[PDB]
Amino acid sequence: RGEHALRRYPTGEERCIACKLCEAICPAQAITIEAEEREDGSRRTTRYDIDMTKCIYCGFCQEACPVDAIVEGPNFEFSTETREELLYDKQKLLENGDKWETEIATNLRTESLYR
Amino acid sequence: EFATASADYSIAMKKAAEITGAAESAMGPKEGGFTAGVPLDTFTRKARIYAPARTASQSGLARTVDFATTTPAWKIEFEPTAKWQNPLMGWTSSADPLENVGRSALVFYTKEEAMRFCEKLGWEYEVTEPNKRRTQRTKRYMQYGDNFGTKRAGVPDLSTLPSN
Amino acid sequence: VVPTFDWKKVPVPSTTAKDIPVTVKGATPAGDLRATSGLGLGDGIKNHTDKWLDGDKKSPMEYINEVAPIKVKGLVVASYGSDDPALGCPVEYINLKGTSLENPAVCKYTGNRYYSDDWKG
Amino acid sequence: TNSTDIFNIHKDTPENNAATSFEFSEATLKVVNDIIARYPPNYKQSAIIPVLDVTQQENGGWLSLAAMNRVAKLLDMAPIRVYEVATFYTMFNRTKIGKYHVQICGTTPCRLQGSQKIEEAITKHLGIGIGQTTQDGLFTLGEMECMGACVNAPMVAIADYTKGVSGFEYIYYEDLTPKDIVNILDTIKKGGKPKPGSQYRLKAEPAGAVHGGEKWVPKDGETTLTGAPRAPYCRDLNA
Amino acid sequence: AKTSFGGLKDEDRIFQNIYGRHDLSIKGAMSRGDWYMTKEIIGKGRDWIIDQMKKSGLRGRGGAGFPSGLKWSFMPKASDGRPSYLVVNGDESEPGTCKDREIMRHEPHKLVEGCLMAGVAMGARAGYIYIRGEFVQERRAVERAISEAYAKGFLGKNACGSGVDFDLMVHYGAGAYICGEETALIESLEGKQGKPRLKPPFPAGVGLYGCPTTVTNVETVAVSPTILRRGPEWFSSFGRKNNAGTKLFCISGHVNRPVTVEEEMSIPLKELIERHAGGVRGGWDNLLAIIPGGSSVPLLPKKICDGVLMDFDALKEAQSGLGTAAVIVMDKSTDVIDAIARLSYFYKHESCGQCTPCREGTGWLYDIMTRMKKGDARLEEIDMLWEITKQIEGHTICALGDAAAWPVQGLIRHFRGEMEERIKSAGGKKKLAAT
Amino acid sequence: PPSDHLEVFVNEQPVKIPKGSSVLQACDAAGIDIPRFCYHQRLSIAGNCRMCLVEVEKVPKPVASCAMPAGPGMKIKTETPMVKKAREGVMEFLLINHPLDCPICDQGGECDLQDQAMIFGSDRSRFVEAKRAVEDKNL
Numbered sequence A: 001r002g003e004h005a006l007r008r009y010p011t012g013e014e015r016c017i018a019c020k021l022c023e024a025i026c027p028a029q030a031i032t033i034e035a036e037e038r039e040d041g042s043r044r045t046t047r048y049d050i051d052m053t054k055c056i057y058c059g060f061c062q063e064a065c066p067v068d069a070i071v072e073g074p075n076f077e078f079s080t081e082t083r084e085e086l087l088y089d090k091q092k093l094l095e096n097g098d099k100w101e102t103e104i105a106t107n108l109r110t111e112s113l114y115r
Numbered sequence B: 001e002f003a004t005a006s007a008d009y010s011i012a013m014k015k016a017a018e019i020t021g022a023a024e025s026a027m028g029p030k031e032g033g034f035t036a037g038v039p040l041d042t043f044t045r046k047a048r049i050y051a052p053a054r055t056a057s058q059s060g061l062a063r064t065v066d067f068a069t070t071t072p073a074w075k076i077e078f079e080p081t082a083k084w085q086n087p088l089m090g091w092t093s094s095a096d097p098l099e100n101v102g103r104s105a106l107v108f109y110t111k112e113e114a115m116r117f118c119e120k121l122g123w124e125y126e127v128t129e130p131n132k133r134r135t136q137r138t139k140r141y142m143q144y145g146d147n148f149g150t151k152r153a154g155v156p157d158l159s160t161l162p163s164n
Numbered sequence C: 001v002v003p004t005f006d007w008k009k010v011p012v013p014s015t016t017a018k019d020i021p022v023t024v025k026g027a028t029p030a031g032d033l034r035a036t037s038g039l040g041l042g043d044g045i046k047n048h049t050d051k052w053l054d055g056d057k058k059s060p061m062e063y064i065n066e067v068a069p070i071k072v073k074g075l076v077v078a079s080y081g082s083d084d085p086a087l088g089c090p091v092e093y094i095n096l097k098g099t100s101l102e103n104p105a106v107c108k109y110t111g112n113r114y115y116s117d118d119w120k121g
Numbered sequence D: 001t002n003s004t005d006i007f008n009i010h011k012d013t014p015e016n017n018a019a020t021s022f023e024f025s026e027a028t029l030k031v032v033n034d035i036i037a038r039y040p041p042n043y044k045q046s047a048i049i050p051v052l053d054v055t056q057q058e059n060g061g062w063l064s065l066a067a068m069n070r071v072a073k074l075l076d077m078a079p080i081r082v083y084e085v086a087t088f089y090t091m092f093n094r095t096k097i098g099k100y101h102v103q104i105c106g107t108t109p110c111r112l113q114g115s116q117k118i119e120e121a122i123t124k125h126l127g128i129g130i131g132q133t134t135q136d137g138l139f140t141l142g143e144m145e146c147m148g149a150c151v152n153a154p155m156v157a158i159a160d161y162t163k164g165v166s167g168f169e170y171i172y173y174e175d176l177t178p179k180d181i182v183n184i185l186d187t188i189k190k191g192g193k194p195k196p197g198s199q200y201r202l203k204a205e206p207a208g209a210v211h212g213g214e215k216w217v218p219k220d221g222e223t224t225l226t227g228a229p230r231a232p233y234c235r236d237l238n239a
Numbered sequence E: 001a002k003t004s005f006g007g008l009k010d011e012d013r014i015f016q017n018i019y020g021r022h023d024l025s026i027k028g029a030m031s032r033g034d035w036y037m038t039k040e041i042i043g044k045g046r047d048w049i050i051d052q053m054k055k056s057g058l059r060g061r062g063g064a065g066f067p068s069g070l071k072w073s074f075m076p077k078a079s080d081g082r083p084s085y086l087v088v089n090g091d092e093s094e095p096g097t098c099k100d101r102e103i104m105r106h107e108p109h110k111l112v113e114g115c116l117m118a119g120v121a122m123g124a125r126a127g128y129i130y131i132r133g134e135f136v137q138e139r140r141a142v143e144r145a146i147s148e149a150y151a152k153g154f155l156g157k158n159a160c161g162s163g164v165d166f167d168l169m170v171h172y173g174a175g176a177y178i179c180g181e182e183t184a185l186i187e188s189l190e191g192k193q194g195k196p197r198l199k200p201p202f203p204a205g206v207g208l209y210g211c212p213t214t215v216t217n218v219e220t221v222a223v224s225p226t227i228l229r230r231g232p233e234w235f236s237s238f239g240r241k242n243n244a245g246t247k248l249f250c251i252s253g254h255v256n257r258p259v260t261v262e263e264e265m266s267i268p269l270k271e272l273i274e275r276h277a278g279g280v281r282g283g284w285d286n287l288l289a290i291i292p293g294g295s296s297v298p299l300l301p302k303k304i305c306d307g308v309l310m311d312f313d314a315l316k317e318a319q320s321g322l323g324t325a326a327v328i329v330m331d332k333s334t335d336v337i338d339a340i341a342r343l344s345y346f347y348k349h350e351s352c353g354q355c356t357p358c359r360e361g362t363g364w365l366y367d368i369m370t371r372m373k374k375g376d377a378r379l380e381e382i383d384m385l386w387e388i389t390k391q392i393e394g395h396t397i398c399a400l401g402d403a404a405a406w407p408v409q410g411l412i413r414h415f416r417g418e419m420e421e422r423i424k425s426a427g428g429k430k431k432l433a434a435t
Numbered sequence F: 001p002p003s004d005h006l007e008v009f010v011n012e013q014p015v016k017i018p019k020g021s022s023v024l025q026a027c028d029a030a031g032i033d034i035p036r037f038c039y040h041q042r043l044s045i046a047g048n049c050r051m052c053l054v055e056v057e058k059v060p061k062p063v064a065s066c067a068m069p070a071g072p073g074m075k076i077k078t079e080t081p082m083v084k085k086a087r088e089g090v091m092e093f094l095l096i097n098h099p100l101d102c103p104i105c106d107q108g109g110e111c112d113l114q115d116q117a118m119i120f121g122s123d124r125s126r127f128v129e130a131k132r133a134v135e136d137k138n139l
């Protein structure tokens, strides 16, 4: 359980559907979510922020999400010189997911037999 | 025969609340608030004593005044205080000490419990009697047979019969 | 008696009239009411994606718009979001009758479109 | 629900739309008004089913949205109830069908008699399956439940819409083999009238049967009510 | 006290023209005993006719077997401001049953006279007949008979010169077996979808338009003047205790001579089928199973069938029912599972969907049966199916849930070996690719 | 008055109720909140949800408390094995065709169906077939 990240579908669409299960389950209160219906009628987030300086990396968010959207990536070397850099927004989380998707998918191909 | 939710630990909480000597304790106005040790300005604000009404979204009635003796259902709240947003993230910023302590913890079986709690603490309080639900139905559709009685269009007139 | 009410004579403020949230075809009638939140008003943002996405990067909306609808036999389709069901979304059953290539049924979970030429057409 | 009607909601079409035009004929209006007299005026909504049926023959075998609107305006009731009733009953067809409507029972007593054989013969000859219509708009095939002719199973009922309300015919054809139904269809096609009821006996009286759904095997056995009919009689009501 | 039943004499059969061999006009019916002494029977009195029907012990032929004498007395004997209605159930959408069709097509005068007698004996101001929509020629014959009776003064003001006033009207359905229920038929009559009401209230207390109304079967109504004319004592001469009288029987399936015949009650199935029907196609030994009461009652295997009689209180103790006394016969070359699955599909298409359990479980039962037919099911899933049948039974608004649940129940109870054999046998054609 | 308030027994509790009241209303006066889906206070009695089934003495079938009138001397039972069995079966029949839309459904968290399934339902499902797909409507 490492850096939280946002996953997409292979066509390119975000997995997160703003069911807010992750925010509800998070005992750290480190997740702030705002969402509305997209212009196409899709139910998508408008604000997706997780405070890494506040996130406890418990992975309960990864347990609660039923669409495998939020995942703690295998990245653990992400220390920053300033505290502000750790205030993760939707855009940086999506960047991290696009970066680390292949490794996370490979791990899920193993973890699926247990999860 | 006595049966009022008689299969739970609540009976053990019914008693030990009526213990002699322990049931005769009393304190004066603002006296308990002195023992609190909190800043004195806490008592300057106003508080609302009430029971929240049933939500329109659901037919549930457990968290309502109906099961009053079953669960503490009287809440004490404070006037909301100035709130704004974080310039860097946009999260809601506030400085209220009494922001959530009531809506999360303060629960009371009867209104008089909260009245005593406020009096011994010195919190100035407002009482708002919740509206009573009505169980008596309307004259129309009073019983299931009223959906199909003669009140819909009156007695059938036997004028279209053959030979009239 | 009981004359009809003229709805067209009602005056409508120009400023409020021009900021009604409308929608593309997508999953709903074109131009229907779109739900919006107060976020983005202070920054004067009237786009859903613009609230969180910055720059001219390809939006997820453009990505999904590049996938052609899928033709499947039958009347009800099952969507999982992946080849293996446990790796995607909960299974969804989507109606395929009255659907065409022009007017298919879009996935509420994944946004994928489907249609069938089995409803006598 | 029935065949050829996969939608319980309106669908737009140049043939069937909000602009559709329909009006009753004077004979149809008179017949409907006579039917209206069967119920009290304060319960004028009770005659909706026969009126819908009569409109169905009048239009030519199916009911359009405009027809439903006109019926509702005739009976002084909301169109929603009319739509509910139209979608509730099997005989009411909401889509354009052929001149002749062929309905086949699929119930198990009919199935055991070789119903699938008759269906297969109809499919092979007419060239269409259930829910389909011939390119010439002549025959419309549909599947039905038990039609109350199980002793003469298998059986088929064919509805005629070529002669309107006054010339409407609902004829039962029973005790059928593939040859029987094919010849019935051919006789209808050439313009003749196929004989009604069973093809090998008059009514439900004891006779042979269809063995395996392909051949009629006559059999002789005890038959009742073969004597002279009983004379009128009544007992002494007094005591 | 006779113990052997059957062999009903032609001179004792109620319907002399059940096959239409004779003339169908009013002159033939009147010459055949119908519309005879009608006025004087009416003048006897309401309670007199009630007592005569009660002595007969005649049961409701709709499918319940309720005593009609107590049934017809449930109407009030006073007046309160509402008119009294009589409605006759003439749908006959029960699979395997085609007797009321024959009654309405060939003997409409008897039915009309029974309607008049029932209206007199219960005080119904007017009468209504709810015939099945597909029965068009039967409806035309009924209308002709009604008009002919009106032409001779039998109906209307001063009925048959008795002082009472009676009216009869004709309605036809539009293809809904759900309309066969009492409240559902009343609902379709009112001009709504045939969605049944709940009891309480009762149609006699509150029926059509909120007025007292009794719904009756065609056969029960038709036999009444003959029972009144020939005597409740003569009617009770047949059958066992509480099961007196004759009955029309529809025999179908793999029968050498399928027929709709009238016969004395309590007759054995073997006698009723070997005689008057030519026996089983391929012989009695080729018999596999028989449903004796239409499609809603449990079926019986060859062991139960050989020895049991056609009676309400004999088939019930056999965990079955007389139903409509409609006979469906299946041989050894038949797929019983396919038959029950097709029955379930029919019920699924016929469910009105007003209440949750039936509406949502008809498709579930159909899919379970369909998977069973291909063998794509498991042993414990049979007990699962039985549990689901218990779930639906007695938990819905009307009895259609019971009508759908019962056939599969008896199917399992009497042929669980066949189902398990099929389930295992699919492994010889499905597991060979799994390895 | 001719006893406008009649008496019944619900789980051996005498409760005084007005005439014309239902068993649902009696149990409400008894302090029991029977699960229900179609009945409403301000609407006519529908009685199609089958979720108000209860047990009465001398009655072989569960009765529709949302619609069943209360008779004097009636006995009502609400915790018998058949009551829970019927409730669980009804919930199962509710959920077999219902689409798995809770993550995208807006009523999640205030869904009467969800809470009633949690309380009066089971935890597992034996339905593995294709559901019924329904097109949406514009109002």
Ligand SMILES: Cc1cc2nc3c(=O)[nH]c(=O)nc-3n(C[C@H](O)[C@H](O)[C@H](O)COP(=O)(O)O)c2cc1C
Residues within 6 Å of the ligand: E059, E060, E061, E062, E063, E064, E065, E066, E089, E090, E091, E092, E093, E094, E177, E178, E179, E180, E181, E182, E215, E216, E217, E218, E220, E398, E399, E400, E403
């Ligand atoms: C699903 C269902 C279908 C029925 N269909 C018919 C029917 O087609 N004809 C009929 O006479 N009774 C039918 N009944 C029985 C009626 O509900 C009712 O009992 C009958 O009209 C009374 O007839 P009786 O006077 O002989 O007792 C049906 C009942 C049910 C539950």
Ligand code: SF4
Residues within 6 Å of the ligand: A015, A016, A017, A018, A019, A020, A021, A022, A023, A064, A065, A066, A067, A068, A069, A070
């Ligand atoms: S990340 Fe997953 S759990 Fe969190 S809101 Fe998005 S879809 Fe729901």
Ligand code: SF4
Residues within 6 Å of the ligand: A004, A025, A026, A027, A028, A030, A031, A050, A054, A055, A056, A057, A058, A059, A060, A061, A062, A072
């Ligand atoms: S890993 Fe734990 S602390 Fe971090 S976002 Fe998920 S639930 Fe919150």
Ligand code: SF4
Residues within 6 Å of the ligand: E178, E196, E350, E351, E352, E353, E354, E355, E356, E357, E358, E359, E396, E397, E398, E399, E400, E401
């Ligand atoms: S059991 Fe079926 S047919 Fe009968 S009322 Fe309920 S849903 Fe309708």
Ligand code: FES
Residues within 6 Å of the ligand: D105, D106, D107, D108, D109, D110, D111, D145, D146, D147, D148, D149, D150, D153, D155, E095, E096, E097
């Ligand atoms: S089984 Fe086909 S008409 Fe009855």
Ligand code: FES
Residues within 6 Å of the ligand: F036, F037, F038, F039, F046, F047, F048, F049, F050, F051, F052, F053, F064, F065, F066, F067
């Ligand atoms: S409240 Fe709907 S069935 Fe009782």
